[PDB]
Write a protein that binds this ligand. Sequence first.
Ligand SMILES: Nc1nc2c(ncn2[C@@H]2O[C@H](COP(=O)(O)O[C@H]3[C@@H](O)[C@H](n4ccc(=O)[nH]c4=O)O[C@@H]3CO)[C@H]3CC(O)(O)C[C@H]32)c(=O)[nH]1
Ligand SMILES: [Cl-]
Ligand SMILES: [Cl-]
Length: 397
Amino acid sequence: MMKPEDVIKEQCARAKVVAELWHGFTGGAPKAALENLVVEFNKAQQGRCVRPVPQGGYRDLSTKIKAAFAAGKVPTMAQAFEANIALYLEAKALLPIESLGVKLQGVNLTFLNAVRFGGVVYGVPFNKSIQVLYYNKDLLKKHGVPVPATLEEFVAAAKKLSRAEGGPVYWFQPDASTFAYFFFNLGGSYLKDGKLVLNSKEAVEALTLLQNGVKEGWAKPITSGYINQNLGSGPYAFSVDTSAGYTYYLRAAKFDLGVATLPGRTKGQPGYGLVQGTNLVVFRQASKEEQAVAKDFLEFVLSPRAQAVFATATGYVPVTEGALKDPVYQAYAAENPDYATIVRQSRYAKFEPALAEWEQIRFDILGQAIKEAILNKADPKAALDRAQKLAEDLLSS
Ligand SMILES: Nc1nc2c(ncn2[C@@H]2O[C@H](COP(=O)(O)O[C@H]3[C@@H](O)[C@H](n4ccc(=O)[nH]c4=O)O[C@@H]3CO)[C@H]3CC(O)(O)C[C@H]32)c(=O)[nH]1
Ligand SMILES: [Cl-]
Ligand SMILES: [Cl-]
């Protein structure tokens, strides 16, 4: 009857034209904030609505988009990572955004650069996250431990707090996103002379750091659920996690949650965070009329108020300069120093490779190498040499 998705269903039933938007939000603040945006957009249109359709998580979404093509029936819009855009571009499946008439002046260059392919923009940055350092303010105060500003300090702090609390206080998922933080901040790069390399010396160093942290009793692998679904079980000091975790950490944490910029190589600058979350793309297969709904919706999404409300509700990074000048954004940042912390971290941002095969590689090849080393004590170099060979085989295929 009156939940936001019930209201959207009633709005789309009355509408002349309905543009489907397929997404990967399972719940929480992200799902609610997307639905609230859509309700507001749909109220403003005479008979021209967006229908958000949850597809599960992001990988369920791309699988379903792939099947939708094979079935010949794609949605008007979807969320897509840069790797998903690369893949959909092989099938010529995406409309250039600037062709549609969406104005992109004032979108963060970081974000716009990531959705530009052969000099053409194919996505609108929508829900873009950055990794931040979550921490337990209470536990650091209890032992006199400053928030670590360098990787050296962070390791030292994890050791000191783990010894004091009798268990590993740095919590991590053994996955490609957590690996990227350590890899990037040890000077790693995935592309060497245009070739994807998973077994570089910095990759080996990064994976060895995490495996040694598990051995030394300062790093705790989280194998079942998000870190924020594991809090309460054992002492927690720190995690490196997406800024879109923010609402889930806040609800779960039974301690005073802190958010900091990432530890870097030196105090000269924060460490680089991995940019995650998604862009909205518009499919060529849409009708001209559905495409016109997409154009109005994308201009609404990029309006400063819509950005301000969406970002402060979720911990995503506002994608426009105008969002930071909007009073609703300003009011929230003044009350909550974590929004500002998330925006400052967004200045020190790195992306994974924008390759069609990258989604498969990050989970099934690279993520599996990281799990072998962390959970089964595989030799880090042996595990990443295996990854490198599977990735080369997949790309050459
Ligand atoms: N398919 C595919 N996924 C990719 C790719 N690159 C990265 N990722 C995944 O992006 C997630 C980050 O995206 P983000 O929007 O920042 O965060 C998500 C959720 O992670 C996070 N969440 C949800 C529930 C919860 O209890 N806690 C919480 O933090 O909230 C958001 C909305 O669901 C990572 C997580 C991952 O899914 O394990 C693997 C990573 C790619 O190329 N393809
Ligand atoms: Cl003590
Ligand atoms: Cl790189």
